[PDB]
Specification:
Blueprint: H1 2-10, H2 15-31, H3 33-45, H4 51-63, H5 70-82, H6 86-99, H7 105-122, H8 131-141, H9 144-159, H10 163-169, H11 173-184, H12 191-203, H13 205-208, H14 215-229, H15 234-251, H16 256-271, H17 276-301, H18 315-330, H19 345-360, H20 365-375, H21 381-393, H22 400-416, H23 423-440, H24 446-463, H25 468-481, H26 494-507, H27 515-530, H28 537-559, H29 564-588, H30 596-607, H31 616-631, H32 639-651, H33 656-673, H34 681-692, H35 702-716, H36 721-734, H37 745-771, H38 775-778, H39 782-793, H40 800-816, H41 823-826, H42 829-840, H43 846-863
Helix pairs in contact: 1-2, 2-3, 3-4, 3-6, 4-7, 6-7, 7-9, 8-9, 8-11, 9-12, 11-12, 12-15, 14-15, 15-17, 16-17, 16-18, 17-18, 17-19, 18-19, 20-21, 21-23, 22-23, 23-25, 24-25, 24-26, 25-27, 26-27, 27-29, 28-29, 28-30, 29-31, 30-31, 31-33, 32-33, 33-35, 34-35, 35-37, 36-37, 37-40, 40-43, ...
GO molecular function: small GTPase binding
Pfam families: HEAT_EZ, IBN_N, TPR_IMB1
Family: Belongs to the importin beta family. Importin beta-1 subfamily.
């Protein structure tokens, strides 16, 4: 009754009464948790209540002692274990179990969720010994709904990726597998049961298959799945194909026999189904195959020894002649009405086609080219659009050499497609041209195709918003690919540069145009500037003034902001303008100096009006960083005005992204200004050291902060002795932070990044103490430096930057203590091995290998005193 109204209000669209209800529930769970549980499970078990109420009760009950988040989950589970009595637990368990039999599907499903949540707690501790036997019995003997719900509960329990729960289930493995497979068979008269069973099998794959190691279980599962894919019922088909997709994703290596035997034909049939949902799943099957094989191809490529090769069966390659024509056919099933990023069959097919091209390379070209030639001039826009889409789709993957003559042949017709009636065809054409430029710019000859290509893309950008993004993307690719050589006076786009800048400035000129088009076009302008040649420098200079003028004009615009939309639009404008400004600053370098005063004036004025969640301060900082790098010691005059803004960004960790940017700015300023930045470094150190005081061990800012220590040390030299005791202390502590015996990828990466920071820090410090003739005061820390060097050497987890920095420090140490004071520590074998490994890695860059060579030489000059 009351709980019915609280639950109904809990689902209410009015957030005031919804939040009110949520508060009532939370309060109820706080005042008497056990009674809260009883009330909810009783409402769930009540056959006189509506399904959605019962489901709501069951969900709330589930959430009373379960959560996705680790810590929440720890706390809530503890509530089930230690804040209930056995009578309440027994009651909740029994009522939940009984509700599985309910003819109301929503109540049954909810009860399955409840049971899974309880099982996750009790089964590892063996506190519900009756459960799995009861579920298996229900799944085999129950009425329709009891079967459905119990199968669902079994699936929920088996899918739970928890080692202890899995292990507790081990003894029930065959009984569970038998129950779900037998439930899924066509001999099962009830289609509802079959769907529940095949779904449960899919959820239980990791568990019941025993990792598919044994042929009997394998054939058992594969037989029923293949059978279910050709079931008359659409839902059963869907469950089957979803199951099949997970099987392929998990057990590719076991699939050869089954692929040849049935999967090939089954998925072909599935892709051509009249039901869009199973068609989607069947296309996804081949997307999964392609993804796997792309990964395998890549891994087997990077491998030196064939014993390291992963099993590879070339499924996609073999299947090309059957699957690709179907995919192309599905490209013609566009829904012009459908929303954006709505995943329909046509976009699914396109994704698959892309992956297919990567997976099989040149093999995909003849069926696609046949399709493109047939349909490029079709009367139905569906087929023309499909044709150009397909063409662009296969640009990334096959041998460039093979594509070059096809691109050359198809360049002019594809450009002509930009004048198609259909806006869909024009958009797909623009994107395809971007794909082409990106993958095969070499095949595009400037003198012949460049000008019309650019003209058509700009024509599209300036007159047709629907294709603006695609045009912008293509244009950016072109600017990137036709950039010319470093130091060059001209590149192919240079005679088009001024016109291009004019066009981009024109389309971004309205204050009422589409904000997304404005943003996209500004990005284009940025990339054009970045890749501009020296003949265009005066134009870039002129552009920087226009951009500056527009930036200045946003300041009174800021004043007119009323709505949140106004705010967002203004912030995108300023962020885009800062991006372009940044581009001109970097491109002009020293030549930017005459506009330095104007730049800092408007940028600081923009900072003073920023606040809250905004992308603007970060863009401003990026532009300022550019100006500091360009003007160097000339930038010092802006430090009086700018430093307090920098300090404030540094001290505010509640804006993580800006804080990180601020730390990067300190590195920029100290490196760009050098010793001229020394008077500000005590303030820097105070903020940096202040940041290090945390309740978080893996402080996200620490790696960059340590790198920053290195830059400051270089800038202030002998001054750094003031900070040596503290910083060395921090560096030594940081060196002990590791991912542990079984760490995540994120923590492994964090530690690699951290140790990059540490090594940079030591590097700057060693240099500072050497040049100030203070190697005596550095001497006590040298042993800890070698210790870390050795730790890095003995850890197969590393980055190129880390090894480079390590080589650098080894060399620095040799310089700092000449005439063989460290000859002993250097002649150690792990040192030599470390350096030799670094110099001999052909995958490393030139900087690193040169640094490794310097390290070797530095070592050698140490051995003999």
């Amino acid at each position: 009754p009351d709980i019915n109204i609280i639950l109904e209000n809990s689902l209410s669209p009015d957030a005031t009464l919804r939040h009110a209800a949520e508060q009532q529930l939370t309060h109820a769970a706080e005042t008497n948790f056990s009674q809260y549980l009883l009330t909810l499970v009783q409402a769930l078990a009540n056959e006189s209540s509506e399904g959605h109420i019962r489901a709501a009760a069951g969900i709330a009950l589930k959430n009373a002692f379960s959560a996705r988040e680790f810590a929440r989950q720890a706390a809530l589970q503890a509530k089930w274990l230690n804040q209930t009595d056995q009578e309440t637990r027994t009651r909740v368990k029994q009522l939940a179990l009984e509700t599985l039999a309910s003819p109301n599907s929503k109540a049954g499903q909810a009860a399955a969720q409840v049971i899974a949540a309880i099982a996750a707690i009790e089964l590892p501790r063996n506190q519900w010994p009756e459960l799995m036997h009861a579920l298996v019995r229900n799944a085999s003997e129950g009425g329709q709904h009891q079967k459905q719900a119990s199968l669902t509960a079994i699936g929920f329990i088996c899918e739970t990726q928890d080692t202890d729960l899995r292990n507790s289930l081990v003894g029930h493995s065959n009984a569970i597998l038998t129950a779900v497979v037998q439930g899924a068979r066509k001999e099962e008269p009830n289609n509802e049961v079959r769907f529940a069973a095949i779904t449960a099998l899919g959820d239980s794959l990791e568990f019941v298959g025993n990792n598919f190691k044994h042929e009997g279980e394998r054939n058992y599962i594969m037989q029923v799945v293949c059978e279910a894919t050709q079931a008359q019922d659409s839902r059963i088909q869907q469950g089957a194909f979803g199951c099949l997709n997970r099987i392929m994703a998990l057990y590719y290596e076991h699939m050869r026999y089954y692929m040849e035997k049935a999967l090939f034909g089954l998925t072909i049939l599935g892709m051509k189904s009249d039901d869009e949902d199973v068609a989607k799943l069947a296309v996804e099957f081949w997307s999964t195959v392609c993804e796997e094989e792309i990964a395998i191809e890549d891994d087997n490529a990077q491998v030196e020894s064939s014993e390291q090769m992963r099993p590879f069966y070339n499924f996609a390659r073999v299947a090309t002649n059957e699957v690709v024509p179907v995919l192309l056919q599905l490209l013609t099933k566009q829904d012009e009405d459908a929303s954006d990023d709505e995943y329909n069959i046509s976009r699914a097919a396109y994704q698959c086609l892309q992956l297919y091209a990567q997976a099989v390379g040149s093999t995909i070209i003849p069926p696609v080219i046949q399709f493109v030639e047939h349909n490029l001039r079709h009367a139905d826009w569906h087929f023309r659009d499909a044709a150009v889409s397909a063409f662009g789709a296969i640009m990334d993957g096959p041998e460039e050499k093979v594509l070059e003559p096809i691109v050359k042949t198809g360049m002019q017709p594809l450009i002509a497609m930009m004048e198609d009636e259909s806006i869909q065809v024009r958009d797909s054409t623009a994107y395809a041209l971007g794909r082409i430029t990106e993958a095969c710019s070499e095949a595009i000859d400037p003198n012949t195709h460049l000008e019309p290509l650019i003209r058509s893309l700009f024509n599209g950008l300036m007159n047709s918003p629907k294709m603006a993004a695609s045009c912008c993307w293509a244009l950016m690719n072109i600017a990137e690919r036709f950039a010319g050589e470093p130091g060059a006076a001209q590149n192919p786009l240079t005679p088009h540069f001024n016109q291009s800048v004019t066009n981009l400035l024109t389309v971004t000129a309205p204050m009422n145009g589409d904000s997304t088009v404005r943003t996209a076009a500004y990005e284009v302008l940025s990339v054009f500037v970045q890749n501009a040649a020296n003949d265009s420098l005066s134009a870039v200079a002129s552009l920087s003034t226009v951009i500056l003028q527009r930036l200045e004009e946003t300041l009174p615009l800021q004043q007119q902001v009323v709505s949140v939309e106004d705010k967002l639009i203004l912030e995108d404008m300023q962020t885009s303008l800062c991006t372009v400004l940044q581009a001109t600053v970097q491109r002009l370098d020293k030549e930017i100096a005459p506009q330095g005063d104007r730049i800092m004036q408007v940028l600081l004025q923009i900072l003073s009006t920023c606040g809250g969640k905004s992308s603007v301060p970060e863009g401003v900082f990026a532009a300022i960083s550019a100006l500091a790098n360009a003007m160097e010691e000339e930038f010092a005059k802006y430090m009086e005005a700018f430093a307090p803004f920098l300090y404030n960004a540094l001290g505010n960790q509640e804006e993580p992204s800006l804080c990180s940017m601020a730390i990067g700015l300190v590195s920029d300023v100290t490196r760009s200004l050098g010793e001229r930045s020394q008077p500000y470094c005590d303030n820097f150190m105070n903020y940096l050291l202040g940041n290090l005081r945390s309740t978080t061990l893996a402080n996200q800012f620490k790696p960059a902060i340590l790198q920053c220590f290195g830059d400051i040390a270089s800038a202030i030299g002998g001054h750094f002795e003031t900070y040596l005791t503290i910083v060395a202390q921090v560096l030594q502590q940081a060196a002990t932070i590791t991912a542990g015996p079984d760490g995540s990828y994120e923590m492994i990466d964090y530690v690699i990044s951290l140790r990059e920071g540490i090594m940079d820090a030591w590097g700057g410090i060693i240099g500072a103490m050497k040049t100030s003739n203070k190697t005596n005061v550095l001497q006590p820390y040298v042993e800890s430096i070698f210790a870390l060097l050795n730790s890095i050497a003995n850890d197969p987890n590393r980055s190129e930057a880390l090894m480079r920095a390590s080589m650098g420090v080894i060399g620095d140490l040799a310089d700092a203590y000449p005439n063989g004071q460290l000859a002993d520590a250097f002649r150690q074998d792990w040192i030599t091995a470390m350096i030799r490994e670094t110099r001999s890695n052909r995958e490393f860059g030139a900087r690193t290998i040169e640094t490794a060579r310097w390290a070797r030489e530095q070592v050698k000059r140490q051995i003999a005193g």
